[PDB]
Amino acid sequence: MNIFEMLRIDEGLRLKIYKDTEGYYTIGIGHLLTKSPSLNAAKSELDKAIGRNTNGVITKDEAEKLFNQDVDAAVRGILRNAKLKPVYDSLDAVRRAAAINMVFQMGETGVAGFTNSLRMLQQKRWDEAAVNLAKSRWYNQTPNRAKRVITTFRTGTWDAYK
């Protein structure tokens, strides 16, 4: 297992514009288009993203292209962030995958708000970080996914994904 397979499990793959768990226009493998309530706004963001007139539909290749860009962007957002970077550097490779998952889902600003959790992760107090991560809107809105990610941070194995 790896970050790409992990995220593919948590996000799914849809080839036509859909609304994510928050109600926002999304396509592909969790690629958020726009928070605007306008489907026309989403269609236009989509055309711009893919570089052609999509009419709200993309191919599998195109979905995987956005996905690659989004994983890369998430990683680069962690490394450029002064609060995320030292935690990520402290982690082993499996738990690094859990951090990228979170940034992918909620953005670098969102994750950098998990100040207490990040400190416990850095000190490698795994059971305590897992308890603190769960006291969150994230965990209450999307518990099955949050549980899988939290378990990954707790154990440093892919057991929640197997």
Which residues participate in catalysis according to the annotation?
Answer: 11, 20
Query: Which amino acid is present at 119?
Result: R
Closest approach of Cl ion to the CB of residue 149, in Å: 10
Binders in 33-92 for Cl ion, by CB under 5 A: 49
CB 74 within 8 A of CB 7: no
Distance of closest approach, residue 128 Cβ to Cl ion, in angstroms: 23
Q: Smaller CB distance to Cl ion: residue 34 or 142?
A: 142
Question: Is residue 144 marked as binding?
Answer: no
Instruction: Characterize 114-125 residue by residue with b for buried, 16 or more Cβ atoms within 10 angstroms of its Cβ, and e for exposed.
Output: beebbebbeeee
**Residue 142: CB minimum distance to Cl ion, A:** 4
Nearer to Cl ion, 86 or 143 (CB): 143
* 153 carries a ligand binding annotation: no
Burial of 91 (0-12, 13-18, 19+ CB in 10 A): middle
32 appears as a binding residue in the annotation: yes
User: How many other C-beta atoms lie within 10 A of the C-beta of residue 162?
Assistant: 6
Distances (CA, A) of 135 to 29, 100, 127: 27, 20, 13
Q: How far is the CB of 146 from Cl ion (least distance, A)?
A: 7
Answer for which of 26, 54, 132, 142 binds Cl ion (CB under 5 A) is: 142
- The answer to the question of residue 152 lying near Cl ion (CB under 5 A) is no
Tokens 């489907």 label which residue? 39
Coil, helix or strand at residue 25: strand
Among 145, 148, 149, 150, binds Cl ion (CB under 5 A): 145
117 is in an annotated binding site: yes
Residues that bind Cl ion in the complex, under the rule CB under 5 A: 49, 142, 144-145
| Binding residue numbers | 32, 104, 117, 132
